[PDB]
A paper describes a structure:
CD1a is a monomorphic antigen-presenting molecule on dendritic cells that presents lipids to αβ T cells. Here we use CD1a tetramers to show that CD1a is a ligand for Vδ1+ γδ T cells. The crystal structures of three Vγ4Vδ1 TCR-CD1a-lipid complexes reveal that the γδ TCR binds at the extreme far side and parallel to the long axis of the β-sheet floor of CD1a’s antigen-binding cleft. Here, the γδ TCR co-recognises the CD1a heavy chain and β2 microglobulin in a manner that is distinct from all other previously observed γδ TCR docking modalities.
To understand the molecular basis underpinning γδ TCR recognition of CD1a, we determined the crystal structure of the CO3 γδ TCR alone at 2.0 Å and in complex with CD1a-endo, CD1a-sulfatide and CD1a-DDM to a resolution of 3.2 Å, 2.7 Å and 3.0 Å, respectively. Here, to crystallise these ternary structures, we engineered a hybrid TCR fusing the variable CO3γ domain to the constant TCR β domain and the variable CO3δ domain to the constant TCR α domain, as done previously. The comparison between CD1a-bound and CO3 γδ TCR binary structures indicated minor conformational changes within the Vγ4 domain of the CO3 γδ TCR. The most notable conformational change corresponded to the hypervariable 4 (HV4) region, which is thought to bind butyrophilin-like 3 protein and remained solvent exposed in the CD1a-CO3 γδ TCR complex. Transient transfection of the CO3 (Vγ4 Vδ1) and CO22 (Vγ2 Vδ1) γδ TCRs into HEK293T cells demonstrated that both γδ TCRs bound to CD1a-endo tetramer, but not to CD1b-endo, CD1c-endo, or CD1d-endo tetramers. Of note, the BC14.1 Vγ chain, which did not support CD1a-endo staining, differs only in 3 amino acids from the CO3 Vγ chain, while the DP10.7 Vγ chain differs by only 2 amino acids, suggesting that tyrosine at position 104 (Tyr104) within the CDR3γ loop is essential for CD1a-endo recognition. Accordingly, both γ and δ CO3 TCR chains are required for CD1a-endo binding and Tyr104 is apparently essential.
Author numbering:
A (entry chain C): 8 to 30, 33 to 248
B (entry chain D): 2 to 194
Write the structure that this text describes.
């Protein structure tokens, strides 16, 4: 369960945590697709003071009510327009630059029944590529997932690999007219022909999906699309 | 009023080359700073370089700013491009006396493309490891100037291209994947070659 991915239904609340240490002001920025990052508010737990940016109703972002804790970032009455990446930020002590924390990605959907985990399939290299190039490209396809909160990795003989791999920079919409469309994502792993031809070598494509939690309820005829890992694997073959 | 505008939406440039990312701003502040950040797909916002309104052109490694104050123009040049320079670059404006918020532009995506010195364009068909009746098409080893055609069909999906780096072999290659759930799918006509 990753704190960087949050999925909520319209009308609920979501708490976003700040990974930066507070001494100074803590600023919160919202970054939506294709738009400029915008500060929403900033606060100081030491003075217990909160400054909202202009155009924001005071009931949208709650900061108090924490059982003896620092000021929090809790978004109330979520709508789809709250979807985006949220960053906390603070100025360096020498005020040289402003430091941003890791972004938390929030998706607010009209119905949690729109949430699906990926199906994963691994496609074995073409013999034509092996014979022509002495290399072997495996392809991993993750399909039918929503939201687009996945991390795809390749594992060879039990160890994650970091070379000979590339994954599409952006998932594509399988039904781009639906708005709530499920997504697809592909990835390649390329090895030498002789490594793929060894039957002892084990290849696994792993897709970490960030989905529903244990607090979530949901009600639909299928397995609860919780945060999970779905994989597909293939072994080497000499023929 | 404070405004920041990055008119370029997306740029592509080969490795080892340079790219200049433009930024035009409006400000009533007498002294200020321009900041450039690099935004990664992991959702990280990484500081690169700062330009002061009274300072000479800033320089930091492969990053340099061409600051034209009278034009309120503040272009970032990235030299000797690497594949890892692919990111979305943000220009931001901040006030110096009481450092407060940053006003951002919308960002400019940079895609760095490999120099395929010996292209070998080819389309291959790959079978599912568990089904064999399911398949995908792989377009690979083409040069970076190749324009991967987009799908002209609802039931046919074509990915963008990505570059992989076989680091133990000093070898990089482009590829794109096509697939469909229809028996009438030919890899040849998939990428419209």
């Amino acid at each position: 369960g990753r704190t960087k991915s949050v999925i909520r239904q319209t009308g609920s609340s979501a708490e976003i945590t700040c990974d930066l240490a507070e001494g100074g002001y803590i600023h919160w920025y919202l970054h939506q697709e294709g738009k400029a990052p915008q500060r929403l508010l900033y606060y100081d737990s030491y003075t217990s003071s909160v400054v909202l940016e202009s155009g924001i109703s005071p009931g949208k972002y709650d900061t108090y009510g924490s059982t003896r804790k620092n000021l929090r970032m809790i978004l109330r009455n979520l709508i789809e327009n709250d979807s985006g990446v949220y960053y906390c930020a603070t100025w360096d002590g020498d005020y040289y630059k402003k430091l941003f924390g890791s972004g938390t990605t929030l998706v607010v959907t009209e119905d949690l029944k729109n949430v699906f985990p990926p199906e994963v399939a691994v496609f074995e290299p073409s013999e034509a590529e092996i014979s022509h190039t002495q290399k072997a490209t495996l392809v991993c396809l993750a399909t039918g997932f929503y939201p687009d909160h996945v991390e795809l990795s390749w594992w060879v003989n039990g160890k994650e690999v970091h070379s000979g791999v590339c994954t599409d920079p952006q998932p594509l919409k399988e039904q781009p007219a639906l708005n709530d469309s499920r997504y697809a994502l592909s990835s390649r792993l390329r090895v030498s022909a002789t490594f793929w031809q060894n039957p002892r070598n084990h290849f696994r494509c792993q897709v970490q999906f960030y989905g529903l939690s244990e607090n979530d309820e949901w009600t639909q005829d299928r397995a609860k699309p919780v945060t999970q890992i779905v994989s597909a694997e293939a072994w080497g073959r000499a023929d | 009023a404070q405004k920041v505008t990055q008119a370029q939406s997306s740029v592509s440039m080969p490795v080892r080359k340079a790219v200049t990312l433009n930024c035009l701003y409006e400000t009533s502040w007498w002294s200020y700073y321009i900041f450039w950040y690099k935004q990664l797909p992991s959702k990280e916002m990484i500081f690169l370089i700062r330009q002061g309104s009274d300072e000479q052109n800033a320089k930091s490694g492969r990053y340099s700013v061409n600051f034209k104050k009278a034009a309120k123009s503040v272009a970032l040049t990235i030299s000797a491009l690497q594949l890892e320079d692919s990111a979305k670059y943000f220009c931001a404006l901040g006030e110096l006396r009481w450092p407060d918020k940053l006003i951002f532009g919308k960002g400019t995506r940079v895609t760095v493309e490999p120099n395929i010195q010996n292209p070998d364009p080819a389309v291959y068909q790959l079978r599912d490891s568990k089904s064999s009746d399911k398949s995908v098409c792989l377009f690979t080893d083409f040069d970076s100037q190749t324009n991967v055609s987009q799908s002209k069909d609802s039931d046919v999906y074509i990915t963008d291209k990505c570059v992989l780096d076989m680091r133990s072999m000093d070898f990089k290659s482009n590829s794109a994947v096509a697939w469909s759930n229809k028996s009438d799918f030919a890899c040849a006509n998939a990428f419209n070659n």
